[PDB]
Amino acid sequence: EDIDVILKKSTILNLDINNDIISDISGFNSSVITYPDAQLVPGINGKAIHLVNNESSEVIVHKAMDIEYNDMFNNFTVSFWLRVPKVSASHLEQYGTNEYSIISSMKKHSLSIGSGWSVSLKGNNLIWTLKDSAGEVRQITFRDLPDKFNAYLANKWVFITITNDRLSSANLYINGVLMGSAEITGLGAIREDNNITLKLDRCNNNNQYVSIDKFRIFCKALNPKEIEKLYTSYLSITFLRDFWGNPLRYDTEYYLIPVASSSKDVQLKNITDYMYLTNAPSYTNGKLNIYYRRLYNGLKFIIKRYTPNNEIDSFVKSGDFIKLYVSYNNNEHIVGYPKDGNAFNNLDRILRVGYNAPGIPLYKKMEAVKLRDLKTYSVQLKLYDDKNASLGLVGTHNGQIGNDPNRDILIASNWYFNHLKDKILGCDWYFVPTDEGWTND
């Protein structure tokens, strides 16, 4: 059939956030009780649920009387956007074995041993548990990647999809990719609690917090194609996104990292001069089997509206014309390309920071766009002159300026426009803002 129709008709619960209110929009109108400390934060498309570690931080969904899908052997799928901060080395050793659930249909503290199902976290493990009324439990334990820059439980919004085919297996996917599975054939009736609880339960780390968005449940075990569609469907090209998957913002400091060479940071030669790539320092921990390129080194960039048009908003949308500045010595210097400014083969125009030569035009009108790699939280920057001509997309060129060492220098080139289909390009940028969800060990 139509994947879109199937996806829609199979939805039996779909939490949305409108006007700061969390409710079910599936149609069965499952009642939603939002406790005092359930906070709201930027989500994948609108706002999202943010949970902290205290009794008042929870959201309870009272399943409608028409929704009891976990019937004798009946299939269901759970999907949602998840964001958990990078567990620090100390906390990993500290609370690494502390399994705490974050979403459950189980009713602990009364009876019905382990009720139905749950989504729990243990150190850097994402766990799915299914338990029937006769004891029987099944699980999928996902062990995240060592490299936290590319891990899934390390401060980036990620799409979780767990399908349950009671006639075969249960499968866990992340951003549409299968990453764990378990047989679940032969389970008895799952008699869970009438409430689905969104809450950090049994977590000993008082500082722990997670973020959940678009929590949804389907009455069928989604297949790879439907999952793949559900996933990409949430990616609205409208607003741009920063490294963590949050909406990109104006007048906010961002460190830039080129997707095509993620181990690199951006440095400035001298004010009025060019920028270039640098190897970022690393953090490695063999005992905890954790490692990642550190963040927050290099130049701080700041996006500003070229001309404060129609609205005093702070969200950057694709197509917005902007001005780029780098903060060096507390002062903000504009980023651009001077007329007839030095360039590599008159193609790759070398960018400059704080260029201020008298009588020389400095082209700095830029457009923030999203022209490719929909799944990656990356942005492209298009530079124009003053006569609406494209001076190219911001990227890098590996050359030598004067007698300086051979470097990967930031430039503006139109060559990019003829390779937008490539996997890895060079004009793709990560905008990294300092976040409490990630501090270098």
Ligand X SMILES: CC(=O)N[C@H]1[C@H]([C@H](O)[C@H](O)CO)O[C@@](O[C@H](CO)[C@@H](O)[C@@H]2O[C@@](O[C@H]3[C@@H](O)[C@@H](CO)O[C@H](O[C@H]4[C@H](O)[C@@H](O)[C@H](O)O[C@@H]4CO)[C@@H]3O)(C(=O)O)C[C@H](O)[C@H]2NC(C)=O)(C(=O)O)C[C@@H]1O
Q: Give me the torsion for CA of 355, 280, 43, 301, rounded to 10°.
A: -10
Q: Does 341 bind ligand X (CB under 6 A)?
A: yes
Query: Taking CB under 6 A as the criterion, which residues in 35-94 touch ligand X?
Result: none
Residue 307 per-residue DSSP state: S
Q: Does 340 bind ligand X (CB under 6 A)?
A: yes
Query: Residue 361 CB, nearest distance to ligand X (Å)?
Result: 10
Which region, judged by CB under 6 A, interacts with ligand X, from 88-96, 125-133, 283-291, 335-343?
A: 335-343
The residue count for binding ligand X (CB under 6 A) is: 11
Sign of the CA dihedral 63, 66, 72, 75? Answer: negative
**Whole-angstrom distance, CA of residue 177 vs CA of residue 160:** 9
Residue 94 per-residue DSSP state: H
| Residues in CB range of 65: below 8 A, 6 or more apart | none
Which region, judged by CB under 6 A, interacts with ligand X, from 63-71, 100-108, 202-210, 269-277?
A: 269-277
Burial class of 281 by CB neighbour count within 10 A (0 to 12, 13 to 18, 19+): exposed
Q: Does 405 bind ligand X (CB under 6 A)?
A: no
Query: Residue 274 CB, nearest distance to ligand X (Å)?
Result: 5
Q: Does 267 bind ligand X (CB under 6 A)?
A: no
CA 129 vs CA 77, 172, 222, 354, 384: distances in Å: 13, 11, 18, 56, 54
Residue 83 or 397 having the CB closest to ligand X = 397
Closest CA to 131 of 69, 187, 198: 187
Please state whether 175 falls in left (phi above 0), alpha (psi between -120 and 50) or beta.
left
Site string for ligand X, 408-427 (x = CB under 6 A): --------------------
Query: Taking CB under 6 A as the criterion, which residues in 283-322 touch ligand X?
Result: none
Q: Does 350 bind ligand X (CB under 6 A)?
A: yes
Residue 159 or 276 having the CB closest to ligand X = 276
Q: Which tokens belong to 141?
A: 């334990």
Which region, judged by CB under 6 A, interacts with ligand X, from 1-9, 275-283, 340-348, 417-425?
A: 340-348
Q: Does 342 bind ligand X (CB under 6 A)?
A: yes
Residue of the chain from 89, 177, 259, 401 that contacts ligand X (CB under 6 A): 401
Binding residues (CB under 6 A) for ligand X: these are 269, 273-274, 340-342, 350, 357, 360, 401-402
